[PDB]
Symmetry: C3
């Protein structure tokens, strides 16, 4: 008999599903609206509250993913999904929905911890439905909420002023959190213990929320997986007006004033703005053209509502709610997936110094390394060997450090020094669910931890006992953090706290504490970037 | 000698005077008074908003446009229903939320006359207020007659089945008009405390629905449904309306990703575009081939949660709704000629044999909703009686008529009676002389025939016999007496029994007299049949 | 260091500009929004408050001029600008801006008198940027504010009823005055002493505002230069519906109803409405067709909001907050500029009684003289001689008396008879900045006083000592009126109050007082029009 819950705006009908072995069924709700569809005049404006509905709303089918490149979008979904078969998704501007997976007995009044997931995809692609919360829900007895937010132009078009401040996608995330606060108890969730976690752009979002005074009170714990507010490619610093003009022109709009641009873009069709998106060619390494002018994506800006100053200035301000914060990275963040997605010219599998330097310059939009610093950086990472293959790999290590390693550690340190409980980890394992095209030597590639965190071993086939073991351990760690703000618990390897000693957990076949993660690196980059 | 100027809440309005043979006091007529904000652009598919107030004097002297509809079908129905000498041609427009007022009072005085608000019919698809001239009824009965318009078809009833487009926009328009009457009618010499809503067909269904709506409680004090009620299933959509909404969206060239998307896309179509979409859907017409259960005759009333919280069938038994005197009536031959002729029925031969009868009844599913299995019983019960092919054709017409109006009307009346409210019923049997030449002379009490008596056609049109004039005078008296007392009885009229347990009704025609248990058998049969 | 002011809606950044002769630099803020951009659903509706902004708004570039005939607008801008080089402008519907010139030292607290300028252009063209308030502000130590308001179809389209009452352009002027009341103090101005002044359509706007209850208490002193509410060509009386339908059809809109028309027009792009504007051929003399049907422009209407009754009815009504009002005219208002802009058939420089009567009839939309009265009028002016060249010049003084001369005197008389301080003046000078295509005999042509009032001599090149001193005198007269409601001051010739003696100031090479301005003319016309 279909589970029915009363939300603030009306009743919703879900479905029961059982995970082999668990007696307690899991109540699943799909496509619950947490805001009014941002259509027509609502485009490029803050999300507004959803209109209440009368009878019972069937929440039993996957919501559309926000408008995005269908090729790249379907591709990322197939790569990150933890469910047996990838589900086809529709595209729409009407995408402000969230999915709920609750193991609570709805006939009673449960108050289980809530874990809100924020997907990645560079703020350009991605969807909530990609991640099935069944296993994590059943296995750790927590409520899992997958949320969506506007992407690309729709979610981040900014004119740098009041006519289109920006960060709509982040405001969308804040709206979902507020929705959780007002409705989660009805789904056996405890609104007083909400944990936000997400990877890549989702991790950067978590990081942004953590620094935003607007979101303060909507969550109690946070987890950033391979992505923080200091992952520069995701945060636009400076004048965002030129980008706005570039988009407006591409879409066939006048650029007389900001209001004109926004009004014009508001009158273009969804399908028309998708074409402008394809023309801009985001998430792709531009091989010709001043690298200092390529915009790999539209992102987070300093709008004056969500963020009042740069992420950097906000940290040194020790001004932000201090909640337990887990920040982690993977051994090889730029190992395969990202270079593959952006079409890096690494067809050869080799790289010599001069070519690495040229590549590093081309990669400017991702690492922002001034042309005069290239020799020092490249020399520091590749100079130690003559093996052209190892240079290519160390080259990939160089990128990962500037985009994820150093930023993540710098963030953790500031959170820590601010007085709040902090924890770090470095995932190093090669999931069997990896793509067939990914070289077998890549271990701990971007996104690899998603399979352990979301229990892919229990939803997909072929997991060895070792993989199944790693997954369970990881879910208990995440869930333990969810309830106590401390990942530790009986039967799990000790996870030291990230204090001045900087201990962190190395996760993989062998999991054990260690210290001073990326210490030399942070020293090298903070110093180089100072010049 | 000087046009009448009335001050309303929203502004001053200027009407004109019109005299009628037999009355000294000219009637003040005001045409096209706005009672809502024009439902254009973003307002399409949303409740009606209050009209903007205006400065100076608004000229209410020309007929307003009629809501977008099939211009051809709309002119035809208007010509067969109009009570004036010559039918008045109308323009089409989305800007159509207007009402016409005909007051017999002297506006230099303080009159407080009973008000009668008319709701035209036309299957919620076509129709207009201007079709009906209240001049005669207003003068002859000293009552204020108000004819209202409301959004039709797609504009008035498009429903996605959920919050993005609940539907019933046309019904909400009717409510908005009644609300307007309550705040302004006193300036026209009317009594806001004595408003009677009446209408026939879809108009009768509207009235019936308003009686069951918590949204209209306290906006009217008496109701009259003529040939149409909430149980006239063809006008009430029961089930999942999502599929129809999608068939409409696709026919208009819209995506159907979600409801919000459908509504957003339809809101951007032009009136001509939505009009073409209307024509392609072929509403108000019987489809001869394919599956009958899938053919959609029109967009109608739905259970939205605002206007109607449950199905009419449920709301009646609830004994939960402000009770007001209610008059429910029907004509002797509802499916006699007009409806079949309009919906283009395959009765071109005048003859019908059992086999052909059972097929026709199955094809008429959207009109009579009878499971293909029940067909035999229903057909035998009506046609089995004889072997004359022509007589079978007639008995078939009485079959359709009892399913669409006859029985529902009596059920609605019984439940209203059992709910503890004053109920009255009638059965009109007369062949107006204003009838169309293409109408078989054997047809008496066709659909819409009482409209000529009620609106006093004999006093506007030409050639009425003293017999027809007298039927009209009697009916207007009964209607107006009901308007002012909730009881049609008064001096100079045959006794109209109340519809109590004895179920006595009034037979109106050349010879008007009381009778009892109208359609008692039919109700029994059909209730028993639909009980499968 | 750039000046930064705090306004209700946010901080604005300007720039300092020094003027030869004054130590204190003048702070100039360009393009400050005073209303929300009137786009989309806001077209043909009252102006709305501007959306507040975060951070610092850079008010340092000229704002667009409201959509208009770009060829006519640039021409008028050039002929009227007081700066050396005319500044080319961009077109936009996003034009509700104002420019501020404050000579106050924003570090201290100043309460300087404020002068708000309302440009002209027949309500069809014009811009605020054309006028530089640098000279006036610095020389007379007042805060100068130039504003903009919707023009043509955008600012005056009227269906004659509630669906589109009209006078949007006038409602904009009122919104800019409220802005001043709420923000001017931050710029060193005194909201308690605001003087509104303008010329031509700007003159008529000021006149209208003096009669409107929507504007009472938004200003304390008024100055109408060559334009008043009785200047027939700018005020539409009677059924305006015909013009509305004519515009709708020209734009390809059904005329079914008022609401339907306005709705259709609201869906037209700026380009489409501009094309309609051009086809309508406004501000141009129509040679062919019934003069009683030609419509030179879209103008002020009796909407029931801004104006409850016609200007004539409101004057004798003695019902309108009284303020010191100054009404003036130029010696030859129809000398060159206007006939040139409207393309008058005066290609021969001569005119015979017959041709004269033809034009006077064709000129109906401007003078409104019934065909039967043409003889009595042409005879009065031209009948004095036989000289065709002398006749052509009298014909011009005939048009000028009807359009500006008479109307002005009457307005001033009624204002006076209502107990309000009144002042009149006749400008009789030929600025050296005149156009080359302008006949050298023309003295005191339309807009000639502008160069004196805005101190053109201190911005442009080649002004003789005579012209420089004239401008200095005019600015003091104007500024004294601004601070006192009386133009007189030490060193300036005596300016009599326009009382029963009807004294006025003749301004030019020799500035002196005189009496009964246009007395004969008024008498003659009042009497004629009575027929
Ligand atoms: O992508 C083509 C092809 O290139 C190889 C080397 O032959 O891998 C390179 O490119 C990958 C991303 O596209 C990197 O992850 C990898 O490290 C680099 O050597 C092949 O493995 C791949 O099939
Ligand atoms: O001109 C009308 C004509 O139609 C006929 C035959 O087609 O009547 C049939 O159809 C009518 C409606 O279209 C029905 O009312 C009628 O009962 C049916 O026999 C002729 O009988 C009539 O003269
Ligand atoms: O451009 C027309 C041309 O006409 C002349 C005489 O040839 O002047 C007449 O027309 C002017 C309108 O442009 C009037 O202002 C002027 O008063 C009239 O004599 C030339 O001066 C002028 O270039
Ligand atoms: C047309 C469509 O596909 N939308 C789905 C909707 C909502 O969109 C839910 O929120 C799921 O997204 O739910 C339904 O089941 C429902 O309410 O009857 C219909 C359909 O399954
Ligand atoms: C003065 C006024 O506002 N009334 C106008 C009416 C209104 O639309 C009424 O609502 C419908 O009679 O319609 C006209 O405009 C029209 O085009 O025939 C004429 C009239 O001037
Ligand atoms: C984009 C541009 O170059 N125009 C300028 C506009 C102006 O306000 C108006 O468009 C014209 O006055 O916006 C600014 O003021 C601003 O908000 O920082 C500065 C900007 O340089
Ligand atoms: C929602 O569920 C009800 C009953 O389970 C069903 O009638 C309805 O059609 C469903 N929604 C859809 C797919 O239309
Ligand atoms: C029609 O309305 C107009 C208002 O524009 C009014 O002047 C006129 O008198 C009305 N028609 C008549 C002749 O009554
Ligand atoms: C305003 O801020 C600075 C100060 O002059 C200026 O350089 C910048 O261009 C302006 N802001 C914008 C629109 O970038
Ligand atoms: P993430 C997978 O959401 O985005 C990447 C970090 C990027 C390099 C910006 C595409
Ligand atoms: P009414 C004549 O307005 O409409 C009929 C009842 C229908 C069958 C729906 C056409
Ligand atoms: P003003 C120069 O703004 O406009 C003139 C008075 C006109 C004659 C209408 C062009």
């Amino acid at each position: 008999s279909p589970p029915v819950v009363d939300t603030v705006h009306g009743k919703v009908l879900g479905k029961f599903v059982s995970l082999e072995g668990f007696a307690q069924p899991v109540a699943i709700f799909l496509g619950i609206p947490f805001a009014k569809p941002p259509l027509g005049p609502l485009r490029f404006t803050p999300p507004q509250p959803a209109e209440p509905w009368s009878f019972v709303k069937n929440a039993t089918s996957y919501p559309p993913m926000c408008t995005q490149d269908p090729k790249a979008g379907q591709l990322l979904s197939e790569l990150f999904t933890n469910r047996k078969e990838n589900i086809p998704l529709k595209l729409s501007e009407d995408c402000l929905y969230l999915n709920i997976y609750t193991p609570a007995d709805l006939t009673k009044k449960n108050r289980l911890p809530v874990m809100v997931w924020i997907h990645g995809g560079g703020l350009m692609v991605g969807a909530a439905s990609t991640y099935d919360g069944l296993a994590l829900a059943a296995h750790e007895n927590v409520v899992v909420v997958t949320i969506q937010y506007r992407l690309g132009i729709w979610g981040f078009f900014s004119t740098g002023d009041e006519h289109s401040r920006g960060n709509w996608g982040h405001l969308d995330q804040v709206a979902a959190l507020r929705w959780v606060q007002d409705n989660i108890a009805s789904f056996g969730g405890n609104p007083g213990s909400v944990t936000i976690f997400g990877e890549s752009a989702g991790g950067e979002s978590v990081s942004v929320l953590v620094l935003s005074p607007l979101a303060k009170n909507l969550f109690h714990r946070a987890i950033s997986e391979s992505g923080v507010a200091l992952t520069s490619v995701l945060v636009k610093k400076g004048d965002v007006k030129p980008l706005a003009e570039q988009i407006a022109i591409t879409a066939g709009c006048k650029t007389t004033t900001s209001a004109v641009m926004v009004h014009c873009l508001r009158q273009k069709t969804e399908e028309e703005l998708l074409e402008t998106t394809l023309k801009m060619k985001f998430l792709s390494l531009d091989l010709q053209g001043d690298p200092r002018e390529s915009q790999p994506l539209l992102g987070t800006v300093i709008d004056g509502m969500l963020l009042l100053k740069t992420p950097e200035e906000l940290q040194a301000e020790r001004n932000f709610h201090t909640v337990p914060y887990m920040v982690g990275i993977n051994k090889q963040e730029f190992g395969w997936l990202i270079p593959m997605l952006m079409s890096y010219p690494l067809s050869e599998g080799q790289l010599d110094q001069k070519t690495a330097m040229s590549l590093l310059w081309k990669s400017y939009p991702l690492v922002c390394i001034a042309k005069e610093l290239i020799p020092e950086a490249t020399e520091k990472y590749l100079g130690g060997t003559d093996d052209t293959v190892k240079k290519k790999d160390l080259f990939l290590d160089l990128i990962a450090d500037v985009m994820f390693g150093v930023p993540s550690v710098i963030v953790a340190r500031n959170h820590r020094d601010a007085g709040a409980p902090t924890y770090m980890y470095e995932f190093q394992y090669r999931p069997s669910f990896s793509s067939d095209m990914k070289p077998k030597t890549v271990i701990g590639d971007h996104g690899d931890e998603l399979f352990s965190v979301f229990g892919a071993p229990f939803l997909k086939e072929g997991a060895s006992e070792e993989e199944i073991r790693l997954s369970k351990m990881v879910m208990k760690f995440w869930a333990n953090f969810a309830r106590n703000g401390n990942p530790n618990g009986e039967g799990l390897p000790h996870w030291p706290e990230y204090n001045q000693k900087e201990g962190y957990l190395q996760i993989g076949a062998n999991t054990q504490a260690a210290q001073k993660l990326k210490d030399k690196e942070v020293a090298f980059w903070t110093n180089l970037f100072a010049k």
